[PDB]
């Protein structure tokens, strides 16, 4: 009986209407991929009781082993997983950087699309911010513990505030995507994440770079990553920010999943 399903003419696939926000659904598949690995991020990462295909029990916190055992069937999630596989090429770390960062770019993109900003304009902002991040990263081995993620966010947020036009909305959200990584370290350590971001921005406002999250259960304060000896690799952050943005942009460019047959 009419009116049936709207915009459904290709093999009866689940085509979300204009009200159902087909783009919003492919993003939700990627956000769920981050929550499966957002908790395993950092030294206090939570282990996963993985059950192998041979009915074998393994308790681990490695991202590559989680995804290799988790049969990811959604194609929108496979793209981010393919970036993790491409992350393994040219570097052997930063896998969860691709999952956590890309999940924040897509999660924050929904706040822009909901306002009414076009998906093609959101992509131009992330591509501009990725190019801007590669110029700021040499100025920052780089500090870890979420230190670069706040400074790189602070430097990119200022570029978006002075840049007029519509690209500033996606450029600012590109900076807030970096904040998800300190928020992951704080949540996995049992600390109010908003208090970590508030302190990390204050010390960076005073110019105290190289300051990261002090990993401690009973101390939500911060410390210098240089004095403690915590350091990350430059190419690990370079190729992670690059592949994560391409995976997020590649998902945003897609608006409809369609079946086929040879």
């Amino acid at each position: 009986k009419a009116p049936g399903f709207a915009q459904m003419l290709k093999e009866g696939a689940k085509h979300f209407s204009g009200l159902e926000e087909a783009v919003y659904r492919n993003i939700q598949a990627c956000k769920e991929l981050a929550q499966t690995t957002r908790t395993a991020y950092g030294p206090n990462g939570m282990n996963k009781m993985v059950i192998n295909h041979l009915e074998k029990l393994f308790v681990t916190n490695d991202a590559a082993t989680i995804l290799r055992e988790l049969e990811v069937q959604h194609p929108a999630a496979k793209m981010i997983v393919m970036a993790s596989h491409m992350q393994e090429q040219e570097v052997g770390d930063g896998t969860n950087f691709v999952l956590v960062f890309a999940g924040a770019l897509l999660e924050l993109a929904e706040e822009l699309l909901r306002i009414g900003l076009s998906v093609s304009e959101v992509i131009e902002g992330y591509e501009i911010a990725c190019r801007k991040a590669h110029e700021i990263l040499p100025n920052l081995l780089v500090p870890g513990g979420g230190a670069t993620e706040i400074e790189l966010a602070k430097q990119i947020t200022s570029y978006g505030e002075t840049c007029p036009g519509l690209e500033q909305y996606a450029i600012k959200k590109f900076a807030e995507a970096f904040e998800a990584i300190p928020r992951a370290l704080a949540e996995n350590s049992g600390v109010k994440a908003n208090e970590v971001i508030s302190k990390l921005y204050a010390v960076h406002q005073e110019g105290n770079k190289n300051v990261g999250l002090d990993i401690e259960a009973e101390v939500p304060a911060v410390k210098d990553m240089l004095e403690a000896g915590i350091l990350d690799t430059y190419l690990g952050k370079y190729w992670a920010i690059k592949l994560a943005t391409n995976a997020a942009v590649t998902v945003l460019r897609v608006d409809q999943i369609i079946m086929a047959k040879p």
């Binding site: 696939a13 769920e32 991929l33 499966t36 049992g190």
Partner: protein, 134 residues
């Protein structure tokens, strides 16, 4: 049509930990009455109908082979204690489920699991130091 799980059953957060805490208490109840020399016996029947009566905690866990994921952790830990020592599997099994029971209401109140681990790692070393001193 297009879903992420497609048979992949998964749950996360506080409900998963609370589910494992309750599953660990089941292994405790199976060896709770056998603690001590005068502990109650346990009757176990294999597939062939052959009976097995024994009040040893280690022998009981070998015959159960519980399929729950969290329960296998205690069984493999208790089995290792039997191979290395041959005694104390019931004390290890009961204390583990009891550490989990006491922190159960705090986990429900929003206390992070990692803060609980720092307490066990801290309280354990203080206890081991008190044993050698006394």
């Amino acid at each position: 049509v297009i879903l992420l799980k497609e048979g992949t059953d998964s749950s996360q957060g506080i409900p998963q930990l609370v589910s494992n805490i309750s599953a660990c208490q089941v292994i405790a109840e199976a060896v709770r009455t056998t603690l001590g020399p005068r502990g109650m016996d346990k009757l176990i029947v294999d597939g062939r109908g052959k009976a097995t009566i024994s009040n040893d905690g280690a022998t009981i866990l070998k015959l159960l082979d519980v399929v729950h994921p969290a329960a296998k952790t205690l069984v493999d830990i208790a089995k290792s204690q039997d191979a290395e020592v041959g005694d104390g599997t019931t004390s290890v099994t009961l204390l583990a489920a009891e550490f989990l029971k006491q922190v159960k209401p705090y986990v429900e109140e929003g206390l992070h699991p990692q803060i609980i681990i720092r307490a066990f790692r801290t309280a354990t070393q203080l206890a081991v130091n008190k044993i050698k001193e006394i």
